[PDB]
Design an enzyme around this catalytic site. Sequence first.
Site, PDB file in Angstrom:
ATOM      1  N   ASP A  10       0.835  -1.194   0.000  1.00  0.00           N
ATOM      2  CA  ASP A  10       0.000   0.000   0.000  1.00  0.00           C
ATOM      3  C   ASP A  10       0.874   1.249   0.000  1.00  0.00           C
ATOM      4  O   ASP A  10       1.836   1.349   0.768  1.00  0.00           O
ATOM      5  CB  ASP A  10      -0.924  -0.009   1.216  1.00  0.00           C
ATOM      6  CG  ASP A  10      -1.938   1.121   1.195  1.00  0.00           C
ATOM      7  OD1 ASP A  10      -1.986   1.874   0.199  1.00  0.00           O
ATOM      8  OD2 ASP A  10      -2.694   1.253   2.180  1.00  0.00           O
ATOM      9  N   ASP A  67     -14.985   3.577   2.207  1.00  0.00           N
ATOM     10  CA  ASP A  67     -14.253   3.851   0.976  1.00  0.00           C
ATOM     11  C   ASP A  67     -15.118   3.627  -0.257  1.00  0.00           C
ATOM     12  O   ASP A  67     -14.922   4.297  -1.277  1.00  0.00           O
ATOM     13  CB  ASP A  67     -12.997   2.979   0.903  1.00  0.00           C
ATOM     14  CG  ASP A  67     -11.947   3.385   1.918  1.00  0.00           C
ATOM     15  OD1 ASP A  67     -12.047   4.505   2.462  1.00  0.00           O
ATOM     16  OD2 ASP A  67     -11.022   2.585   2.172  1.00  0.00           O
ATOM     17  N   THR A 104      -2.913   8.682  -3.471  1.00  0.00           N
ATOM     18  CA  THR A 104      -1.935   9.382  -2.645  1.00  0.00           C
ATOM     19  C   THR A 104      -0.572   9.426  -3.323  1.00  0.00           C
ATOM     20  O   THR A 104       0.078  10.478  -3.356  1.00  0.00           O
ATOM     21  CB  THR A 104      -1.831   8.714  -1.273  1.00  0.00           C
ATOM     22  OG1 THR A 104      -3.104   8.762  -0.618  1.00  0.00           O
ATOM     23  CG2 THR A 104      -0.796   9.422  -0.410  1.00  0.00           C
ATOM     24  N   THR A 105      -0.124   8.296  -3.875  1.00  0.00           N
ATOM     25  CA  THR A 105       1.149   8.266  -4.583  1.00  0.00           C
ATOM     26  C   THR A 105       1.076   8.957  -5.938  1.00  0.00           C
ATOM     27  O   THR A 105       2.119   9.310  -6.496  1.00  0.00           O
ATOM     28  CB  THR A 105       1.620   6.821  -4.765  1.00  0.00           C
ATOM     29  OG1 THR A 105       0.637   6.086  -5.503  1.00  0.00           O
ATOM     30  CG2 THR A 105       1.833   6.158  -3.412  1.00  0.00           C
TER      31      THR A 105
END
Lengths: 543, 518, 534
Positions: free
Chosen positions: B48, B386, B81-82
């Site tokens: 993750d 989510d 996020t990345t």
Amino acid sequence: QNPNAGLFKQGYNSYSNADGQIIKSIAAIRELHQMCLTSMGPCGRNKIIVNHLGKIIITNDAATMLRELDIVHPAVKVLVMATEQQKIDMGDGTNLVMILAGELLNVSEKLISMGLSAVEIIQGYNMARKFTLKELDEMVVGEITDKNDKNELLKMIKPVISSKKYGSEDILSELVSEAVSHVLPVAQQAGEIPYFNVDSIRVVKIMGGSLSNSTVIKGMVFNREPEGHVKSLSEDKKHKVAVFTCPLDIANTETKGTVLLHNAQEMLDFSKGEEKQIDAMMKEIADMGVECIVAGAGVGELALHYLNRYGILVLKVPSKFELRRLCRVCGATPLPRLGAPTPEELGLVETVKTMEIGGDRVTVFKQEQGEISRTSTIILRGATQNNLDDIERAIDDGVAAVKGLMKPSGGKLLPGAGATEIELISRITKYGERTPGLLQLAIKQFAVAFEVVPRTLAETAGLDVNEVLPNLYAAHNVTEPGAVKTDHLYKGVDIDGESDEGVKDIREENIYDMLATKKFAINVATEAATTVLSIDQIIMAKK
Amino acid sequence: ERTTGRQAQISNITAAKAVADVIRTCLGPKAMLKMLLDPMGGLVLTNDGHAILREIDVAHPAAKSMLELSRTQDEEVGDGTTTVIILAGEILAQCAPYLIEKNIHPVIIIQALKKALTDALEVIKQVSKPVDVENDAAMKKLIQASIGTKYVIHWSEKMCELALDAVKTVRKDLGQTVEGEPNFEIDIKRYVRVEKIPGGDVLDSRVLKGVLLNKDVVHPKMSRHIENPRVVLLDCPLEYKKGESQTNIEIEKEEDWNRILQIEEEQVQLMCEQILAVRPTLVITEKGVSDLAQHYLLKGGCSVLRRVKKSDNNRIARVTGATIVNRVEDLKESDVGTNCGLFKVEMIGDEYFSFLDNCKEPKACTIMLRGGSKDILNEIDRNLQDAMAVARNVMLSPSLSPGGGATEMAVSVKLAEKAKQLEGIQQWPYQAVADAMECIPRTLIQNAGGDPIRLLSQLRAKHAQGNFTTGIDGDKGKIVDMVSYGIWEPEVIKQQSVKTAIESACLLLRVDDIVSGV
Amino acid sequence: LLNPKAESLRRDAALKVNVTSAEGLQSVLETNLGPKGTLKMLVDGAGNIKLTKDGKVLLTEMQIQSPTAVLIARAAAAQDEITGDGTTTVVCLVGELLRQAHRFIQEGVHPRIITDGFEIARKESMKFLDEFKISKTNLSNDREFLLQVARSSLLTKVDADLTEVLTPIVTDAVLSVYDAQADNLDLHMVEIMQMQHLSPKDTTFIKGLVLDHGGRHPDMPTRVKNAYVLILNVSLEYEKTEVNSGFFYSSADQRDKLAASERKFVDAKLKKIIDLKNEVCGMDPDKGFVIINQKGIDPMSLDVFAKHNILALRRAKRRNMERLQLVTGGEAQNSVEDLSPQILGFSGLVYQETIGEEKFTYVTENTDPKSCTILIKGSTHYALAQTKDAVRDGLRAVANVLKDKNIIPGAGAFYIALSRYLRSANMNKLGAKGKTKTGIEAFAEALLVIPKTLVKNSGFDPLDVLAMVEDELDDAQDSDETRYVGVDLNIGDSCDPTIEGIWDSYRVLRNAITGATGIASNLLLCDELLRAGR
């Protein structure tokens, strides 16, 4: 404790591709690349290199500096030999080849970071070169008619003399164009046989005076003194001149004839013999009508005494290379013997005098009309010794461009000073999207490699890099309400240092780059970068 | 200590590139696993992206700023996020030679990033396609993006029904130009709060409208089920009232001590009579209830419920209409138990419950999750939040954007076309933005194993003349269209991705100096 | 791209270190595989000599800083909680699979395709797993077949001389505790006792339950046949006041007064117990009477029990008493006043083994004991640890044989056939992928490490024994019948694994392929080693 591995051959300094050798070869050239970036252009700067003979020499031209520098890197020698291609085969582009070939390696690092093979990088430049060479034929606007007129030569010679000793280009152009017009023979409707020669113009310099006091004379001017009581001849045309290779001395015998000293009776015959024989040999020379004797070797003491009574001008030329070009002027032939001035080997000269150049008396060898000579001389004057060295080298580069005016497209021209380099970028990027495949990466980087030419002209001029670059882009890229692109394609990098703002058409100053210089420099720049990119490994030893 | 001059700009780009260096292969569904070596001897093999960054300890302060900006993105959205760090990291890498080697002023680059951000958002709106928010079948293939590769993949069909029922209840159109328009106005936080129910089956999980309470009837003999319960909410518990300070009662009279003991019983009874003034059938108390008040309210025919959290009473008042009052003597008659379907206490999982659920929407809901174990409930919990976050992302922005590197490359093609008409010094750093936009599709190629040079040349060519519908398939690895396989993501994710990346890239360019000390 | 105090391996350097670190642990458990393997001694800090070939026990007794062995240690922990055996084989499969894949990494094969080729080969392995498996009947007459399965588990963990001793012990231990029905089996119901006195070759199986503390009297009978067991909760020993006190008599008259206070509760219970022997088993021969008595015994009752030849017991373990209720059937009696003959249980021959340091009592030969005890004997401490590891691994291996009706032959019959099948399956079918077959071949070549390892520890040429099996498999493919081929470690030629009796559990090999696939894949998926948190 730490073992060694990876070198299986012998003790040496070894470089491999796993260590980034292709970057090290470019970084080694980059050390000498920055020196040439500040060279080309009228705002360029001069570098000092002390010769191995203990003499300080300063010059703008890189082709001369690369010879005086000690280069242990063989990758740089590829560009040095490529620079010799610009100096020998052509008269211009020595400073441009080092900037282009050096930038082609810099833009290639972006393709290496992406992991592209060097072969596709070379194949990309080869396909982009044929796209550029095809456009160079369409980049020509005007063409020199090759009329060889004094006013027509000032158009081609002025930009060639430029980018060295800026501000003197107007005075030096009148001196070179006057000497070239004298060497060029009068002919019409014949283009088969070449005429102009580079060695036909010999430049001299003498300390004293100024640049405005320089003149142009038809002939080969000698700086040596007459050495004898006869300073100069008369104004009568067609003076007979004899060129003697053997030094002036007592006549000898072709078979043996060795002089040896034994008894004092022979010593008196040697002194009295040289007095009677030389007086007899020099008399036969004056009886045939020879008023001038050119001796390539030394002259004895008794020879100068007898020639003063006969009224013969003594002229010594210790340089044998100048006597070969002297035969094309007066028409005389060198004689290995002495005492037999055959009239078939004698030439004719209209005027031989002695004039003061820079404060010193020198014997001038010139003519007027008859006995057409192919050799001219450019006389220079100045106080500074170092400035006169670059002026003579500027004339040599100026007359070498006249050799490029011959049949192989010598009249075609293209706008320089950054005008063409920017316009070619839009044409290369036009072919980037037109040509599908992996070549799009190398073609786009091939046009970016031409951005260094206008950038260095702005850096050497003190201009801001953030200013000239976007101004040239908007000048060469416009939207015209029509099919044909119009208005100004001539916008270059202005010398500035004065006036108002921005850039301007280079046609106002009548400055342009010759097609023979630009087209040939691209082929040399690509082949120089092709060799470096094709070498992924080298093996050297400690020097 | 202190770093001034251009050296701080080098360290700021290096720190941002070093943090992005870790997550380079952490982007995409094909992202591989990382091994983190802890100083105590522990290892974390999870792949993750945002779970690793919280465990990474960095030195340079610019590297700490990327962790703080990623923490804000982690709370807003669950994924991507990345994506922001890699995109913002490549912007600084492509603009690194321009800022130093080309001697370009940083504000000129920052101002160019502002114009590139506005032009990028316009291209994202052009490449987006409309989607029906009222289609139940279309929302299942969307929400599934946050479902698959998890244990809930088998129940995914039921997982989408639980998500849509909660979003449709809390959404308010209110479209108009008068007071301003929130698009669909979804609030996940307060109203959609979920209470996990042990036992049962995942297929039986339903979305209840009301408030669920675990506390049962507090009296041994009392009515267990009320037909139409009337809720009464209050703050102060039911017991003898005492002062908030030290109280000392000194009585020197004999028979007044027995009167005080009677007042203690009358004070509790008086609190029960004030509640019975409206004749309620149900009494809900926030705090505990003494045994004395249980007998007084038992004779009145009303259930007693203690031990209720304050956060529930706020939701109980809205699902009922009972007005929360502090002092029982101040209880207003406005309290109503209307709109309550059933009081049924029926036991589920060997534990007695309380159900306030009704047949109407009181601008809220309570999701009831049931399963075969508590570990399944905690897995469905975070996944449902989510799943609704992705559902909220589709509702707020009624458009979808192509995934798999299609949107990233399509913008870079449009940025290259707009660079020719800019005609300024910002053109050079503006072209570096398009080069950074091409790194994200190149990132998926390096993770897939294909040739990045051969594919990007073909990928970029398919956007210009192929209507920018051609992406890259993750499972196969061949360049294909995104209309066939149906890979689509909401626009708000693509909007916040490029918006935060520019804000993260500019923030590091704004700091040219780093100093230390207190 | 670094900060102070940082070490990070990037590019393919981390893959080279992870495989190299895996080759070290591979060779440690390589020589420990199979009955012909090596038995290694592990002593960490305790001076305690322990010899075992179990792969999980090795990693728990050794501290390894290498991060590659950490995930392998987690893999051995998951195999024990599910399969319970085969921890050494799984490690050997993960190690060689990384070596065959590391050679393709230098070729340029991306590790994702390497992992994708493993999942495709794993799905194809499950298809061959169902075809190659042999369904065993649920009938209880398979004890003869269970002897072959029991030897396969024992020969690995011992010197093979103890296998023949533990063969009837382990086999009868599973069948005695497991009633014959569908049902299930419970290994906790089989007790394990450890003794350091007698040699390990003299060990025997205990059908009943054994206890520690017995009654000590010189007149106690050595052997009592068919005795009744009675649990007794009352105290038969003299007691004192909660505060320290004593009874000191100065005369014979004060002796009977002070002593009667202590034995009042004793005699009330004692006289009622001996009356039970008068009513039951008074006349009847071939019967007996036994007292459990969790509490102690005074010296007065020892003479009373000696006159009636009653077996005496004191200080009994509470956990064993709950098992005595199942074995004997007697209920725990809290008060003798309520004691009835219906509470009395039934037991067989009870004889006490007499040793100076410790004494034993055998409750064995019971009608419905519903319990088992495995008595482990050994001269040294490491001999007890090795035998206890073989019994616990032997019981859990046979446990999966009765629960799982499918059985697989061992001796490399499953590994050689699966490696040859997967190699020829993708060539004929051609339904996987063009590029992926490179990574699929790496998994097929990694399945032959086990048969090459078994002969490597025996010193035989792994290339010679491999060509002999392939020649027998080619003869088996020509014929249309079903013939299984396996490697014989003793002779060195091939063998029929069904006749030789080498069998492996189906559940152990089912999780070995899937387990070794995911663990070895995650190690190749690691591009960079991250050092942070400090």
